């Protein structure tokens, strides 16, 4: 190709969207945004194929242009806006607040939350660096750049971000015994406590995770998301509690 | 400004400023000829509209309001016997000034007066005061829909209490001077 | 007699409507016209016939039953605002727009592409030339 692509075939689309293969020839291509293409749920799929509030794309466009949908406290009008993991979707008219968390099957689940829980989100600290004029900042998994962070915050820790102000309320270090959600691979969606972090210099680090049901599994560090202390997650978990 | 939107574009959806909606708006409920739910009644106007609004509106405040008053509006004698508590709850929730729940509450307030007209007179002073505060509150958050609901609620009350208010029209005027 | 039942009723304040699956049992009858169903769902939900739309009726094999989708808008204005244009045309709420076939419009578009500007100058030039 001679430039960026702008179409997506249905067969080429991510499996976990669960798109009918016979409905059409193309699937919604997520626009650029906080989350990568393959790890995102465009708003059209969420509003049409999950909540069923809209019966066709034009209805989704009409809903969005009414400004009834808020993503992380901000109004979005893009049909293919890439909502993703730990994203808060608010529909005031229906009095509904959703958090995008994968199920044990490995698909985004329609998980309803209260307003108090919807007031914040969690972000995995992807990077920590000094910006211009020597101002430290942290970049999270959702592309949020937050200045003046706590010095103790390091890579792979989890920061609780208040949506209204976009500031760090609290943080959780990456350490053994912490509660962890898997966001990648075949173990995607499982929940368990850390046991050990295998560190290989110049290679991918591996983390051993132990579920409540005593089963153990090993996953790459990139698919790990710390969500709280064992038995005390900082977010309401979906049905099944990431078991099996 | 000098010229209004006299010539309409081919667009199906067009932006309209809050002031633009207000100018076109006119308070005359009898002019509207859309079917009214309360025209069809089995027990009372309040229950007929109350059932409808439960199924359309899902706002946090209205759902809470329905739960408190659901048991006490099943039959017209129940409404009359429990008129005091129903009115206080209606006024209490309207005070929250939640736009997502005003439309059902305001509609029910008018229909509430419809069910027990002469007995609503003891509630007449408080209802008008609550509406006036709501409308004064309505100025700060611009929503032409809120004004339409509030004044239509005011118009409906006059329609149902036309006989009694007319005898003391000056008193009704005195309330609305502000 | 003929029976109608609405199931899977979902309230949609986003589009300001109620969406449901309509099941019509019509023994000893071929099938039921859409306009009658609109009238009658309107009577049921206590809304205008103009605010009620129905589509996707398929008679079950062997006859005697039909299944489809139905929408009831909170107000007729909302229905006019959100409904598809073609469905509005079906119910008479909107008038069919008369337009030329696709080939004719495309040929006109190409011809207009060939000409630059208003073209009155070209017209007067050719008039003078001939």
């Amino acid at each position: 190709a001679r430039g960026p692509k702008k179409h997506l075939k249905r067969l080429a689309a991510p499996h976990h969207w669960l798109l009918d293969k016979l409905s059409g020839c193309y699937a919604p291509r997520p626009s650029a945004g906080p989350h990568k293409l393959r790890e995102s749920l465009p708003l059209i799929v969420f509003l049409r194929n999950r909540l069923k509030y809209a019966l066709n794309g034009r209805e989704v466009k009409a809903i969005l242009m009414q400004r009834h949908v808020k993503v992380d406290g901000k109004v979005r009008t893009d049909t293919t806006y890439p909502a993703g993991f730990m994203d808060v979707i608010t529909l005031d008219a229906t009095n509904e607040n959703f958090r995008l968390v994968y199920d044990v099957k490995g698909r985004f689940a329609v998980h309803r939350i209260t307003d108090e829980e919807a007031s914040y989100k969690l972000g995995k600290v992807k990077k920590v660096q000094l910006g211009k004029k020597g101002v430290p900042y942290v970049v999270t998994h959702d592309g949020r750049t937050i200045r003046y962070p706590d010095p103790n915050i390091k890579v792979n820790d989890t920061v609780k971000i208040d949506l209204a102000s976009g500031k760090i309320t609290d943080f959780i270090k990456f350490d053994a015994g912490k509660l962890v959600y898997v966001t990648g691979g075949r173990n995607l969606g499982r929940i368990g406590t850390i046991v050990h972090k295998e560190r290989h210099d110049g290679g991918f680090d591996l983390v051993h995770i132990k579920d409540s049901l005593d089963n153990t599994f090993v996953t790459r560090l990139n698919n790990v998301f710390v969500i709280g202390e064992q038995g005390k997650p900082y977010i309401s978990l979906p049905k099944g509690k990431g078991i099996k | 400004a000098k010229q209004r939107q006299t010539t309409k574009s081919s667009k199906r959806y067009r932006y309209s400023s809050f002031k633009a909606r207000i100018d076109d708006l006119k308070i005359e409920p009898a002019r509207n000829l859309e079917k009214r739910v309360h025209d069809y009644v089995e027990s009372s106007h309040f229950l007929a509209s109350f059932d409808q609004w439960k199924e359309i509106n899902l706002s946090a405040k209205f759902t809470e309001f329905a739960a408190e008053i659901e048991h006490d509006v099943q039959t017209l004698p129940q409404i009359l016997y429990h008129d005091k508590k129903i009115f206080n709850s209606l006024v209490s929730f309207i005070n929250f000034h939640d736009e997502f729940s005003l439309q059902p509450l305001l509609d029910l307030l008018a229909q509430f007066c419809h069910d027990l007209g002469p007995d609503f007179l003891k509630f007449y002073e408080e209802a008008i005061k609550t509406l006036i505060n709501l409308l004064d509150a309505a100025i700060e958050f611009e929503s032409s829909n809120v004004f339409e609901w509030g004044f239509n609620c005011l118009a409906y009350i006059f329609k149902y209490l036309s006989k009694f208010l007319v005898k003391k029209l000056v008193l009704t005027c005195d309330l609305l001077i502000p | 007699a003929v029976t109608i039942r609405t199931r899977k009723v979902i309230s949609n304040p986003l589009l300001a409507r109620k969406q449901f699956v309509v099941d019509v049992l019509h023994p000893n009858r071929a099938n039921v016209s859409k306009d009658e169903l609109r009238e009658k769902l309107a009577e049921v939900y206590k809304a205008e016939k103009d605010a009620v739309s129905v589509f996707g009726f398929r008679t079950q094999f062997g006859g005697g039953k039909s299944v489809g989708f139905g929408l009831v808008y909170n107000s007729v204005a909302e229905a006019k605002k959100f409904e598809p244009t073609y469905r509005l045309v079906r119910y008479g709420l909107a008038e069919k727009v008369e337009k030329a076939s696709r080939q004719q419009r495309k040929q006109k578009k190409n011809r207009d592409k060939k000409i630059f500007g208003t073209g009155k100058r070209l017209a007067k030039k050719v008039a003078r030339r001939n």
Partner: peptide
């Protein structure tokens, strides 16, 4: 923290007959 409680459906089926 507990998740928000599911809301019983607001709308219910309804029926008539004619002719």
């Amino acid at each position: 923290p507990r998740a928000a409680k599911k809301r019983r459906p607001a709308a219910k089926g309804k029926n008539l007959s004619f002719k």
